[PDB]
Design a protein around this ligand. Structure first.
Ligand SMILES: *[C@@H]1O[C@H](CO)[C@@H](O[C@@H]2O[C@H](CO)[C@@H](O[C@@H]3O[C@H](CO)[C@@H](O)[C@H](O)[C@@H]3O)[C@H](O)[C@H]2NC(C)=O)[C@H](O)[C@H]1NC(C)=O
Ligand SMILES: *[C@@H]1O[C@H](CO)[C@@H](O[C@@H]2O[C@H](CO)[C@@H](O)[C@H](O)[C@H]2NC(C)=O)[C@H](O)[C@H]1NC(C)=O
Ligand SMILES: *[C@@H]1O[C@H](CO)[C@@H](O[C@@H]2O[C@H](CO)[C@@H](O)[C@H](O)[C@H]2NC(C)=O)[C@H](O)[C@H]1NC(C)=O
Ligand SMILES: *[C@@H]1O[C@H](CO)[C@@H](O[C@@H]2O[C@H](CO)[C@@H](O)[C@H](O)[C@H]2NC(C)=O)[C@H](O)[C@H]1NC(C)=O
Ligand SMILES: *[C@@H]1O[C@H](CO)[C@@H](O)[C@H](O)[C@H]1NC(C)=O
Ligand SMILES: *[C@@H]1O[C@H](CO)[C@@H](O)[C@H](O)[C@H]1NC(C)=O
Ligand SMILES: *[C@@H]1O[C@H](CO)[C@@H](O)[C@H](O)[C@H]1NC(C)=O
Ligand SMILES: *[C@@H]1O[C@H](CO)[C@@H](O)[C@H](O)[C@H]1NC(C)=O
Ligand SMILES: *[C@@H]1O[C@H](CO)[C@@H](O)[C@H](O)[C@H]1NC(C)=O
Ligand SMILES: *[C@@H]1O[C@H](CO)[C@@H](O)[C@H](O)[C@H]1NC(C)=O
Ligand SMILES: *[C@@H]1O[C@H](CO)[C@@H](O)[C@H](O)[C@H]1NC(C)=O
Ligand SMILES: *[C@@H]1O[C@H](CO)[C@@H](O)[C@H](O)[C@H]1NC(C)=O
Ligand SMILES: *S(=O)(=O)c1ccc(CCN)cc1
Ligand SMILES: *S(=O)(=O)c1ccc(CCN)cc1
Lengths: 728, 728
């Protein structure tokens, strides 16, 4: 009998996966929210005490969306009235609560509609952005000091990013960086004066008689980009009747000569800051390490302290160049860069010398550097078992790079093959986060002995619940395409009968450096499709995919829509020969870059796919943003790459859609992949005489994530697939 | 014969319906284009002569889409470079050709992008609107003289209407009226300064990197309306060094008192003009007959020359008050108004008296007055056979209202029951245009004895072609609803088998004064559904429908979405009882008001309809324009009709859509029923967890009329209906 995992199970999150979020606040203590109380845990012995009782929240009078405790632990910030903006940005109201006198501060309160706020790294100073300008509050009860006066809606942004820097460069809204001891406050200023505006209708509540027009400075491929300025403010002199003491640091001449982006800021010491810049082409970046000159207040650059990173086969880094990890003294740093074999590994650099020494090597890649001490460097890589979709924490001895230990590989080999980690200050302890293939497992460890101190969350509750349900299994393996081994995964229906022929849904992402095949545990729409509807859902990482070296990743350089699309077709062709696949019922779907590939695949005329669903797809590269698009395609000009921009549109393949059943879905308020992309695509299909189906989602953005829209789109897509597969 | 009328036949117009368009230019002559050239036909003898040979058309720029010969026959305007704007408005380029010299006017050319142009009634003066300002040219070869200087895009309109006046008041773009002998040029000025703008994206050709935002001053229900000023210009003094001599005529005090509209302008003599105004509420209108005062140049009104028309049960007229038809001397006029019984009939008014005398009466209505001479009045009515969906031409003797003769009733009784007419200058001759129920037939008659004279176009070619196709048959009949007889029509599949149970499609309009049931012959989508897919298509005119008296038409006053919706359900229930109808397969569809009613019907939870399709439906009256909406609903305020605005939205019935399969279609560039309406409806259905289908049409307007979109929508709707009806 047994219950299966149903669409409703997926949509209502009936089977809850638990996690354990902690905030390290010292080298051996972390804050954790439990039953709405804020508890202070001591790692040394496992004991804890109440840091803030939940009664305090009952007393506030508003739904508290989040909180942040001052480093000296004297104050806590309460965030409420949360209003989402783009992928990372939002605005909110904030109250500061005095933990000593356990009273709420009511004098000189933080303004409503605040865009960003952060405590200094030590003490309890605050810096925040409001109306695009920066403000600094030395004391929670004292008036704040305005730092910038140029902030202007849709034009000048001080301390927060504009749309494209938020989405494609920083992957954050914040653009301010306090120095380690709070002496200086660095910030970036973005100028969008010349950037064209994307405009679209937002309908709002039914009572709004006239729709509003949203306007966002958004540079599409080849358009005018925002400019940026970087400043370091000496906060020691801030005073109501004092001017602001600040110094502008410009990029090195090799980047200054043309359009560029600021892509990284790293404080090294109180008097040394590292700036990472990249040319608009994105195959040339430079790290500039500037020293504070105490006699003049300026920040000095030197050719000796500059480090260039380039790429001859594609772009630099995965989505941006990797960040440098400096030693405490700041005289050298470690950073992931492509080695001579095209694999991303850790290189050790001396701050004032240009050559580096690789400390890791092999046909696998380091994902990120997690922590560094005078004696060891901790990092995550997919070296274990040589599987690119796995992740483990390793520790390397700095005085002898040949001494490397895998700290997580053998803890729970069958249950845990994909880890992330979080270290306390000075890396004395670490939380290990196991995400699959079994149920997520959160544990705490001691770095001095590498003993597991305790299990923080093991998902025993979920485990129980799932025993009564017929869950599908997820299998990973490899296939060969053009002489290269590539990975795939299949979510297989319960009681999988190798004998029977099942319909097959290809779920696709496939963007540059994408990784859709991994050992992560997920309760997804695919889980329901396999468990209840008996559909095999497969994914494949082909050319252009990441974490397998530049030869694979850079294969689609300057030619998006070619090899990654062809590989999905070839992989599927091989899947359709495995014997348990009903070749009469093969579909493909994807969101975003996956919607573009899904559409390009359906437009290929391969005869492999009966139907497909594209959600919020890119349809023509000139419609997407400059930073992302140009990174992989260059400029849409005849002198550069216009030809490949032109024959990589989905519209160019309209005629082939006559042989397939297609469902095109898009939110009308998508600020990222504009509804325009699907509107131009449908128009080309209508012009070619192609019948297909559509579904717009009013006022939904790129995530089509409102609670009702989320339920609606998956329900609608389930119906479409089941009709395509003749499933009742 | 064994083939049917196919979707391709409909979409590609394989079967051509011919017509005969002529332009009367004297009391006995008309111009007609034959094989690209213009011929001058003599009605009397039937002999023609070349007036303007073909080939003379040097495809100037593009092609001549229309011509106009000056009254004195000395010149001819060629219209080309046609660029559509809204329903009636468009811009074009014009060339003037001298018929005497047989030369093209090469100097002082009409501007490119001219909004409206017209010859004076006599002679050959020209008046035209360009960039929202009026210009007059006394001679084709002479420079034009500017009349207004206030023209401003989206703000001030001189000589042409703004959006709402074009669509809802004048049903025309022109707002210029020459006096009978060309002395005066009257015009209206519209001021949209305070009218809110509807804004929506227009994507344009795929090459446009950023979408455009269209903005149109459009007053939704209850919003600030445009204001109007009416002027009469004395063209005798127009000179480059002279100012403009003009006089502004304001409405009578009883209308000037509040928001109002100018709804009619009729020149009576060279010194008398008739203005018809209506209050914003549209239940009070007044005709003001002003006389020119030769000593001061003023146009004077007098209470004795004012005629009031009001409605206590609804609005005035069908869509606006009917126009007065003055006698040659201007001392009296004839106008259609509602009877004591609520039937629209012709009343004879004395220009300076308040009481009028009805010259027609009966349980039927006069549709319009076509021509007037000193002895007779010709009008069109649906008196014949008591079928309101029929139309015939009548003549009534002015000195004896007992003498009324039907001129078209008996010409071809079985083939022709729906006519319109076009009379020569002194009503000496008239063209009769038969539109059905048989193939259209155009004929020429003489008024003297009403002799048939000749057949202009009989469609014998279409007839020959159709004998080989299995055509469906159209039948009209009546059903009794709550004591009243209402008409319906059914398009029945060929070789109809009474033993079979046919699926049924209700095609609905149902707006106030609508008439969906008539004896007009049409080759439509329904012809195809019945001929090829064996689907019966029916239509019904219930409460709120027109041409059957005010009791039926005003039934839905201040309550749109109630009785007309309920009557479609009740009528369908009766049809469902017929043994040859499969009551388990009934669908309903409509466009515009019909989309609204289709949606309201589907949301009624009646259990009668399995599925339906709404194309560009109104979904909430507060989103539609002020003139149309308020005419039937009053104001959306608590003191007036807010309660009925609130419970007549489609969104209020969202829950009930869970019982049906619904397809919602809308053009994103719809300037009339804004995409907003469907965007808000879809969001409410999503919010209620209801599944349905949608189809947006990029850049299509209210008619979804471009060649490829037209084919695509009907093809898509056909597949949706076949799927709903389980038809192969
Ligand atoms: C404020 O803090 C108190 C703790 O002092 C919260 O009380 C605790 O509430 C949790 C949540 O319901 C209780 O846990 C439950 O325990 C049973 C164990 O059998 C388990 O079945 C549930 O799944 C859950 O784990 C906990 O026992 C209880 N502890 C105390 C001290 O009574 C209280 O909920 C907080 N108030 C608010 C408004 O959050
Ligand atoms: C755009 O056009 C290029 C050049 O014609 C395409 O690249 C070729 O693709 C074919 C078919 O797969 C290969 O056999 C050739 O080797 C390729 N030539 C080159 C110069 O690369 C490219 O696939 C097209 N892009 C898209 C999205 O269709
Ligand atoms: C169009 O109508 C507007 C009013 O809606 C007129 O604007 C007013 O003009 C007067 C005189 O110049 C000012 O005193 C008012 O302040 C204006 N109203 C506002 C708030 O705009 C405008 O003059 C009219 N245009 C024409 C040519 O008639
Ligand atoms: C809006 O509400 C009015 C008032 O309740 C509705 O009118 C009633 O309709 C019912 C039919 O179910 C009749 O039995 C009553 O006689 C009506 N009462 C009145 C005051 O006329 C009206 O139908 C509703 N409109 C819509 C669109 O649902
Ligand atoms: C844990 O216990 C130690 C002593 O054993 C004590 O110093 C520490 O403060 C305790 N931590 C908390 C906050 O529970
Ligand atoms: C922003 O850039 C524009 C040029 O694109 C310049 O004119 C303006 O002064 C700049 N504003 C600031 C505050 O730098
Ligand atoms: C700053 O100047 C203002 C006068 O403009 C004065 O009220 C205040 O006392 C001054 N504060 C300081 C820092 O001296
Ligand atoms: C970086 O890209 C630019 C523009 O496409 C190109 O001219 C340059 O050679 C590239 N640099 C390298 C080292 O590949
Ligand atoms: C012009 O008229 C002649 C007959 O008078 C006709 O044969 C010819 O086709 C016409 N030219 C065209 C095609 O416009
Ligand atoms: C028709 O013929 C008559 C003579 O019988 C002639 O006077 C008239 O001008 C002709 N009409 C035309 C323009 O063909
Ligand atoms: C009108 O004004 C123009 C100014 O250039 C002048 O040349 C012309 O003579 C005037 N008209 C007359 C003749 O009064
Ligand atoms: C005309 O309509 C208004 C409301 O829009 C109303 O107050 C008035 O009574 C109506 N007049 C007549 C004659 O019904
Ligand atoms: S992918 O999932 O690695 C991914 C997601 C989002 C982005 C930002 C592009 N706008 C890039 C890559
Ligand atoms: S109906 O066909 O009598 C009809 C058609 C168009 C309108 C204008 C609505 N804006 C009204 C009625």
């Amino acid at each position: 009998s047994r219950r299966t995992y149903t669409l409703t199970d997926y949509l209502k999150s009936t089977f809850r996966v638990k996690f354990y979020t902690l905030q390290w606040i010292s080298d051996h203590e972390y804050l954790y929210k439990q039953e709405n109380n804020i508890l202070l845990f001591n790692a040394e012995y496992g004991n804890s005490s109440i840091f803030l009782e939940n009664s305090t929240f009952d007393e506030l009078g508003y739904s508290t969306n989040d909180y942040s405790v001052s480093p000296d632990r004297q104050f806590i910030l309460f965030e409420y009235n949360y209003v989402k903006q783009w992928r990372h940005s939002y605005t909110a109201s904030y109250d500061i609560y005095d933990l000593n006198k356990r009273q709420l501060i009511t004098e000189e309160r933080i303004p409503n509609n605040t865009q960003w706020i952060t405590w200094s790294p030590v003490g309890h100073k605050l810096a925040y952005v409001w109306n695009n300008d920066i403000y600094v509050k030395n004391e929670p009860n004292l008036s704040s000091q305005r730092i910038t006066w140029t902030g202007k809606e849709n034009v000048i942004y001080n301390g927060v990013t504009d749309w494209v820097y938020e989405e494609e460069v920083f992957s954050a809204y914040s653009a301010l960086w306090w120095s380690p001891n709070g002496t200086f406050l660095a910030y970036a200023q973005f100028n969008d004066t010349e950037v064209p505006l994307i405009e679209y209708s937002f309908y709002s509540d039914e009572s709004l008689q006239y729709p509003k027009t949203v306007r966002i400075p958004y540079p599409k491929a080849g358009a005018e980009n925002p400019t940026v300025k970087f400043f370091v403010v000496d906060t020691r002199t801030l005073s109501p009747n004092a001017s602001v003491t600040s110094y502008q640091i410009v990029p090195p001449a090799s980047v200054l000569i043309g359009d560029h982006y600021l892509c990284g800021v790293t404080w090294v010491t109180e008097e040394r800051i590292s700036l990472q810049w990249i040319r608009r082409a994105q195959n040339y970046s430079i790290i500039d390490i500037c020293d504070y000159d105490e006699s003049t207040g300026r920040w000095i650059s030197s050719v000796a302290r500059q480090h260039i990173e380039i790429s001859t086969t594609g772009w630099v880094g995965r989505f941006r160049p990797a960040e440098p990890h400096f030693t405490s003294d700041g005289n050298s740093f470690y950073k992931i860069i492509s080695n001579e074999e095209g694999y991303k590994h850790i290189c050790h650099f001396q701050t004032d010398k240009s050559n580096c020494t690789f400390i890791t090597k092999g046909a696998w890649e380091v994902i990120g550097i997690e922590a560094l001490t005078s004696d060891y460097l901790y990092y995550i890589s997919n070296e274990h078992k040589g599987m690119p979709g796995g992740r483990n924490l390793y520790r390397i001895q700095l005085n002898d790079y040949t001494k490397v230990t895998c700290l997580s590989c053998e803890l729970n080999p069958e249950r845990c093959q994909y880890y992330s980690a979080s270290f306390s200050n000075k890396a004395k302890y670490y939380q290990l986060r196991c995400f699959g293939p079994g149920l997520p497992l959160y544990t705490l460890h001691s770095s001095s002995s590498d003993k597991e101190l305790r299990v923080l969350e093991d998902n025993s509750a979920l485990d129980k619940m799932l025993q009564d349900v017929q869950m599908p299994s997820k299998k990973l393996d490899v296939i060969n395409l053009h002489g290269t081994k590539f990975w795939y995964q299949m979510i297989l229906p319960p009681h999988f009968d190798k004998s029977k022929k099942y319909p097959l849904l290809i779920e696709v992402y496939a963007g540059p450096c994408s990784q859709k095949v991994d050992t992560v545990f997920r309760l997804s729409w695919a889980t329901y499709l396999a468990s209840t509807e008996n559909i095999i859902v497969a994914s494949f990482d082909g050319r252009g995919s990441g974490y397998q070296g530049d030869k694979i990743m850079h294969a689609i350089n300057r030619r998006l829509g070619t090899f990654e699309v062809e590989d999905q077709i070839e992989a599927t062709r091989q899947f359709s020969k495995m014997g348990f696949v009903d070749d009469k019922r093969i579909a493909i779907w994807g969101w975003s870059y996956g919607g573009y590939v899904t559409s390009m695949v359906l437009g290929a005329g391969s005869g492999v796919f009966k139907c497909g669903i594209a959600v919020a797809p890119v349809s023509k590269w000139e419609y997407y943003d400059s930073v992302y698009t140009e990174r992989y395609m260059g400029l849409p000009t005849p002198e550069d790459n216009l030809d490949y921009y032109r024959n990589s549109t989905v519209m160019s393949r309209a005629e082939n859609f006559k042989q397939v059943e297609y469902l095109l879905i898009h939110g009308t308020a998508d600020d990222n992949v504009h509804f325009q992309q699907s509107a131009q695509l449908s128009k080309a299909l209508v012009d070619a005489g192609v019948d297909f189906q559509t579904m717009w989602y009013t006022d939904e953005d790129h995530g089509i994530a409102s609670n009702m829209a989320h339920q609606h789109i998956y329900t609608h897509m389930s119906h479409f697939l089941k009709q395509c597969f003749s499933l009742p």
